[PDB]
Amino acid sequence: RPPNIVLIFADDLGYGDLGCYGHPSSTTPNLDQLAAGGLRFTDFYVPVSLSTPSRAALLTGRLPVRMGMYPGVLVPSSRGGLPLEEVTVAEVLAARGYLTGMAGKWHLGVGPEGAFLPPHQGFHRFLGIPYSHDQGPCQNLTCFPPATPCDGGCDQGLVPIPLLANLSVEAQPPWLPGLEARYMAFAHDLMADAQRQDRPFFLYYASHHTHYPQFSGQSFAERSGRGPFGDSLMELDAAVGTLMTAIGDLGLLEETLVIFTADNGPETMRMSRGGCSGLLRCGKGTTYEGGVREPALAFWPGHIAPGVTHELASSLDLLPTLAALAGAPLPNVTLDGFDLSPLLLGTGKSPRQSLFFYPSYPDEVRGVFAVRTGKYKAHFFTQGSAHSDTTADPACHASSSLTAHEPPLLYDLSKDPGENYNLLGATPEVLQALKQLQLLKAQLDAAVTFGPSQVARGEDPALQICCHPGCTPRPACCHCPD
């Protein structure tokens, strides 16, 4: 019997935000305990530093450029989305007899009649927002009870963020100081129903937590010590605790695999209300470590022994790994990941030796921006980001334009994870690594062909989810609070 898989996916969380990663003010007890009793990756990566492309890779196990998930991210009125021809991790597990369920952020397309929503991609049940919770006006929305408004006002001229139950609206806009609870209830029911049916479950919990605007329930409002960002993180942390308690009540601890990760680096433009990359450089939107190296925790009593691993792992590896753990056969399409089960179970080492990073806005001429092989990371092209502004490092700012590098900036991450000292700024070891890194790039650029841009398919405001069909005057008239 395959194990119960619980996949927690954080939004805009940095490498140095969790307590178990050394943050001085963060409050993350549950996550610290999960790490204390399980594997903790120090070198877990994501191919792209943005929500849409990153998530596209997690579910499909393939580089975002293949399925046209570029450039940037999808908006509410986007005409495209994650292709149906694509096979998600939910689809492979469902065929294996898994009760699949997703709670939270999707951001992988909505399309016409909701053709791109979770129910059509392999999930049995679904409760959450079709995209980032800031993609819709929030001037009047309350982020912290009793009545503390969400700063910034969010994306204007849009229909309020809808809380969809499968394919139909449940609220619009939902009550943020209580949206988390709805997810936990949904999660507990999914597991309970799965238990009584003698059927394994799969909970993809894509939290809105630590993405702007920062929100929370009265239970965490001003309780972290790190302010708004802290309270939001404390809620995400508590959500992990409740899921563990629920699994504990059902007596599934040793029969359930829990995994925690985030989609991309910290949005430092949010300043004190944003995440922290720690010692790593830059953040969200950039190909620097701070934006692509995400925290990761593997928990599974009696199977995954507690410790810390410095071995190379990526979000592209989850699908094949989970498929191997569930006995579910891998899809026909070429995956860009590996089976990390040996590493998790402790029977061997990780088969991942190289990592490829693409920019927020890729093209077939420049190709991959950075490649890592072993402890060496080359930067063929560097670029800053608006998401990584307000930092002391000028390289992260939007001011820093796309500059090419020949020879590339070579960094030894084992002794310089902060990417401060360029080696080629020679040694037989270094020189050999260079020729290797240059060849790996050329090989991928030659093989990988960019799939048709889904984002370039245009926008149509008629695709915006409205609570009252044939409403007037749209989109403001689309309403149905709690």
Ligand X SMILES: *[C@@H]1O[C@H](CO)[C@@H](O[C@@H]2O[C@H](CO)[C@@H](O)[C@H](O)[C@H]2NC(C)=O)[C@H](O)[C@H]1NC(C)=O
User: What would the x/- binding string for Ca ion be over residues 43 to 82, using CB under 5 A?
Assistant: --------x-------------------------------
CB 190 within 8 A of CB 183: no
Instruction: Return the one option of a second copy, ligand X, Ca ion, none that residue 51 interacts with (CB less than 5 to 8 A, by type).
Output: Ca ion
Instruction: Return the one option of a second copy, ligand NAG, Ca ion, none that residue 461 interacts with (CB less than 5 to 8 A, by type).
Output: none
Taking CB under 8 A as the criterion, the residue among 156, 272, 401, 427 binding a second copy is 272
Q: In whole angstroms, what is the distance from residue 396 CA to residue 412 CA? A: 20
Q: In whole angstroms, what is the distance from residue 25 CA to residue 23 CA? A: 6
Instruction: For residue 271, state whether it binds a second copy (rule: CB under 8 A).
Output: yes
Instruction: For residue 283, state whether it binds a second copy (rule: CB under 8 A).
Output: no
Cβ contacts of 304 within 8 Å, gap of 6 or more: 38, 39, 257, 298, 344, 345, 346
Question: What is the number of alpha carbons within 13 Å of residue 45 lying toward its C-beta?
Answer: 27
Instruction: For residue 394, state whether it binds a second copy (rule: CB under 8 A).
Output: yes
Q: In whole angstroms, what is the distance from residue 154 CA to residue 410 CA? A: 39
Q: Site for ligand NAG (CB under 6 A): how many residues?
A: 4
Instruction: For residue 417, state whether it binds ligand NAG (rule: CB under 6 A).
Output: no
Q: Which of 122, 120, 100, 97 is nearest to 110 (CA)?
A: 120
- Distance in Å, CB of 98 to ligand X, minimum: 12
Q: Edge to edge, what strands does the sheet with 201-206 contain?
A: 168-171, 163-165, 125-128, 99-104, 201-206, 4-10, 256-262, 296-299, 39-41, 307-309
Instruction: For residue 438, state whether it binds ligand X (rule: CB under 6 A).
Output: no
Taking CB under 6 A as the criterion, the residue among 29, 134, 145, 165 binding ligand X is 165
- Chain positions 419 to 448 lying near a second copy, rule: CB under 8 A, are 420-421
CB 477 within 8 A of CB 468: yes
Stretch that binds a second copy, among 79-87, 107-115, 131-139, 221-229 (CB under 8 A): 221-229
Q: Which two tokens stand for residue 5?
A: 């898989």
Instruction: For residue 267, state whether it binds Ca ion (rule: CB under 5 A).
Output: no
Q: Which two tokens stand for residue 473?
A: 């005057």
- Distance in Å, CB of 162 to ligand X, minimum: 13
CB 31 within 8 A of CB 237: yes
Instruction: For residue 188, state whether it binds ligand X (rule: CB under 6 A).
Output: no
Residue facing ligand NAG at closest CB distance: 140
Taking CB under 6 A as the criterion, the residue among 137, 162, 228, 275 binding ligand NAG is 137
Considering the complex, state which of residue 103 and residue 467 has its C-beta at the smaller distance from ligand NAG. Answer: 467
Q: In whole angstroms, what is the distance from residue 305 CA to residue 44 CA? A: 18
Q: In whole angstroms, what is the distance from residue 176 CA to residue 178 CA? A: 5
Q: Site for ligand X (CB under 6 A): how many residues?
A: 7
- Distance in Å, CB of 152 to ligand NAG, minimum: 12
Instruction: For residue 229, state whether it binds a second copy (rule: CB under 8 A).
Output: yes
Instruction: For residue 140, state whether it binds ligand NAG (rule: CB under 6 A).
Output: yes
Distance of CA 311 to the CA centre of its chain: 20
Instruction: For residue 136, state whether it binds ligand NAG (rule: CB under 6 A).
Output: no
Instruction: For residue 126, state whether it binds ligand X (rule: CB under 6 A).
Output: yes
Measure Cα distances from 367 to 343, 354, 409, 443, 451 in Å: 30, 16, 16, 11, 13
- Distance in Å, CB of 142 to ligand NAG, minimum: 11
Considering the complex, state which of residue 185 and residue 426 has its C-beta at the smaller distance from ligand X. Answer: 185
Give the amino acid at 39: L
Instruction: Return the one option of ligand NAG, a second copy, Ca ion, none that residue 137 interacts with (CB less than 5 to 8 A, by type).
Output: ligand NAG
Question: What is the number of alpha carbons within 13 Å of residue 470 lying toward its C-beta?
Answer: 0
Q: Which of 347, 260, 269, 245 is nearest to 299 (CA)?
A: 260
- Distance in Å, CB of 471 to ligand NAG, minimum: 14
Instruction: For residue 443, state whether it binds ligand NAG (rule: CB under 6 A).
Output: no
Instruction: For residue 139, state whether it binds ligand NAG (rule: CB under 6 A).
Output: yes
Q: For 196-200, which contacts have Cβ atoms below 8 Å and span 24 or more sequence positions?
A: 197/99, 199/97, 199/98, 199/99, 200/1, 200/2, 200/3, 200/4, 200/5, 200/96, 200/97, 200/98, 200/99, 200/326
CB 232 within 8 A of CB 214: yes
Instruction: Return the one option of ligand X, ligand NAG, a second copy, none that residue 140 interacts with (CB less than 5 to 8 A, by type).
Output: ligand NAG
410 DSSP β-pair partners: 378
Considering the complex, state which of residue 132 and residue 277 has its C-beta at the smaller distance from a second copy. Answer: 277
Interacting residues with ligand X (CB under 6 A): 124-127, 165-166, 186
> Footprint of ligand NAG on this chain (CB under 6 A)?
137, 139-140, 476
Binding site for a second copy (CB under 8 A): 16, 19-25, 42-43, 225-230, 271-273, 276-279, 281, 308, 310, 390-395, 412-418, 420-421
